[PDB]
Design a protein around this ligand. Sequence first.
Ligand code: PC
Ligand code: CL
Ligand code: CL
Ligand code: ZN
Length: 537
Amino acid sequence: SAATGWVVLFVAVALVVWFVSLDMRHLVGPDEGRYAEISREMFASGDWVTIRYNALKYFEKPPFHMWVTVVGYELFGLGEWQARLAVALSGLLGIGVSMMAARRWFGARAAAFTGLALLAAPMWSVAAHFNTLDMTLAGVMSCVLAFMLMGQHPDASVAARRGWMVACWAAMGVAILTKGLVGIALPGLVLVVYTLVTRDWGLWRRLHLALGVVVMLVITVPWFYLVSVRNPEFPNFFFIHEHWQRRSGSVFYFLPLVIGGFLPWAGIFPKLWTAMRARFRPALMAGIWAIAIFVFFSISRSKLPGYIVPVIPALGILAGVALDRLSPRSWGKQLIGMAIVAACGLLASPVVATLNANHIPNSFYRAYAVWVAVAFVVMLLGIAVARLLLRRGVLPSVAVYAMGMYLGFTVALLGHETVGRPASGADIAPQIAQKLTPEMPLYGVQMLDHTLPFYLRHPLMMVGQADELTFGATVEPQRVVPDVDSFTKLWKNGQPAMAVMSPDTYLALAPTLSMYVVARDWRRVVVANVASLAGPQ
Ligand SMILES: C[N+](C)(C)CCOP(=O)(O)O
Ligand SMILES: [Cl-]
Ligand SMILES: [Cl-]
Ligand SMILES: [Zn+2]
């Protein structure tokens, strides 16, 4: 316990950056806003069974992420960092259990390398600070893998093996309550593939199959029964609905995602392979985890980046052992390569200053470019001081390097606030809230705004195409305007209300109905049907 004062320092500096950075960006739609708002509505209603999005049934996802977010709301009230609490705790959880399994099978030093690996991995840290279900599922599934590895260690008693096995099945249950059957399909897949490569059938006896299935059913079934009974249309939807938004992604879709999301360790990607090929083989289990899940999502029709996040913890374990075998000169090689590519990021950072996308003007991206450049600069600093610390050992150099990378990608994420804040609509929320009341409708005229209703603490009344709310709009049609043509009669003859639409929608409806503009930004026009709810015009 000589240099423990460094570790305590390191982790401390990590944790404060881990949580403070949560509350420094406005919510980025659709995901962050969608789950923050669903959780808000659950929090305000108390109905933890029937998930609703803008007062409409939302049966596209299971509720565990929302349960966690709602507990967070009850403890610390509504806000940005509270809405991102589930994913941050999921990230810490993946780090923790990952280096627990690493410490069990490969020792303390390798476990430290695993924690550093997951910390520096931009996919794990970014995804850990971005409110989406993929990081929650990644943390609970990392509990599946880690608990499975803990339970298969020979030096554990039958009581410990059963404890880690029921812990594994329980984690699979939570995962099913997080994003559906994936939480059990991917493990089983990774399981059978394993038993085909190693030809160890007796492993199916160590799983505690009966007890684990029973405890998993006890965890998952109650909510599914409740929501299926209260809403008979739920099971056919959740298990049959082919969801799609506005697919067609190549089989190489997740290749730049996995490479970029594990970038500070890309140079040792071969040394990860030579980590698994070289009774129970844990590194091989992690490798079959990452590879099997990767090829599973790579051959799937629907592809989203977050799908691939659950492979990162396993990679972390592999990284932990690979870095554990490196001499000082080899890590020097890695530092040289990463210094090169980070310097290329610094030279290429002005590229984003020439961007304008998602109806966000170029200026915000000019302000993003300086933050990206700063990010690669702090990466370079961390690399330099790591090279200075290489004389004291590989582990301190890797620790400083990983800290530099983590702070770097953290700066790169916080810099996204430049383009995320004008899109969130939080700026024009106070202007709207001055005249908008909770009993007033806020029509969404063919626009599913994912962030503004959260900031208004006020749900949208969907008008016309409800997008992913279509299903909800059809099973409870008394809560929704079916088409814009009915919205015109509601608008000219109904109660005083407001409406959110796109600018092109405003110009399309302008010759039809006169509307007084309450607020505008680059992505939305907010109007009222009475002149007294807006500024002079
Ligand atoms: C996306 N969805 C929830 C509508 C269908 C997916 O369900 P499942 O793959 O968990 O069975
Ligand atoms: Cl509220
Ligand atoms: Cl701004
Ligand atoms: Zn859908």
